[PDB]
Design a protein around this ligand. Sequence first.
Ligand SMILES: [Mg+2]
Ligand SMILES: [Mg+2]
Ligand SMILES: [Mg+2]
Ligand SMILES: [Zn+2]
Ligand SMILES: [Zn+2]
Ligand SMILES: [Zn+2]
Ligand SMILES: [Zn+2]
Ligand SMILES: [Zn+2]
Ligand SMILES: [Zn+2]
Lengths: 104, 104
Amino acid sequence: SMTLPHIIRPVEEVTEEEIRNICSNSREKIYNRSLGSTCHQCRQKTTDTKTNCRNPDCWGIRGQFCGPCLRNRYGEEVKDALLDPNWHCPPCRGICNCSFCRQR
Amino acid sequence: SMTLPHIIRPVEEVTEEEIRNICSNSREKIYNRSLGSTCHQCRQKTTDTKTNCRNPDCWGIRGQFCGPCLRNRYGEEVKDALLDPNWHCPPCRGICNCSFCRQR
DNA sequence: CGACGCCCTGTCGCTGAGAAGCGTTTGCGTCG
DNA sequence: CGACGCCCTGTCGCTGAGAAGCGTTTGCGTCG
Ligand SMILES: [Mg+2]
Ligand SMILES: [Mg+2]
Ligand SMILES: [Mg+2]
Ligand SMILES: [Zn+2]
Ligand SMILES: [Zn+2]
Ligand SMILES: [Zn+2]
Ligand SMILES: [Zn+2]
Ligand SMILES: [Zn+2]
Ligand SMILES: [Zn+2]
């Protein structure tokens, strides 16, 4: 399998350090292939905090969005999504506007 | 990867033995997990000859259809599909009417 | 097309990826 | 729902499956 396991992270286990590490400007991102995570929208693997989709039927990294991408393409803040127990990713909601998803 | 490799079989290498082994009645199928092949439509893994999709972008077993399923659900004969160098499977043509494909 | 100046500080291309098959599985109608 | 008789000899459920990320990647307009 090429799919990374999807782990639903409860809102109670989100720390202040993770909230602080949310990216506020994409030019400030730190790239790391070992420790980073990929944003579904911009497809960059970086160390900033990203969203966690809480739909049990979600899979892989499709639910991971960086701060700038979420706020610019969906009007949502990553902090609110992390603190939302019912948050579903735009791919789960069927409203993802990334190049691939809107190409289909 | 869970995907079986898709191998395009040229029409010149289709033998008379394969043509003879095309199923003409689903009740006559012989099941075998090691030697059989799965029909995408009825999802039965049997030893009768099945179609080979020749679209290079096809993948997996989605292009494999047994005789009865192809003739009953698409009006096509497996022999003609095997002897057709341009044949594409109904999933590739976007006209598959199996339970899963029409469920989507 | 790349510097170059603005404000709303941003994004797509390409490769290789995209299940399969066992289990509970076989059309229609009538009827007990 | 399962035998039961016809003709056009047939089919779906469920589980687990359903990429990810490096490379060529960052908005608008004008203009050289
Ligand atoms: Mg896979
Ligand atoms: Mg391939
Ligand atoms: Mg799973
Ligand atoms: Zn992003
Ligand atoms: Zn999701
Ligand atoms: Zn998308
Ligand atoms: Zn079949
Ligand atoms: Zn195909
Ligand atoms: Zn199908």
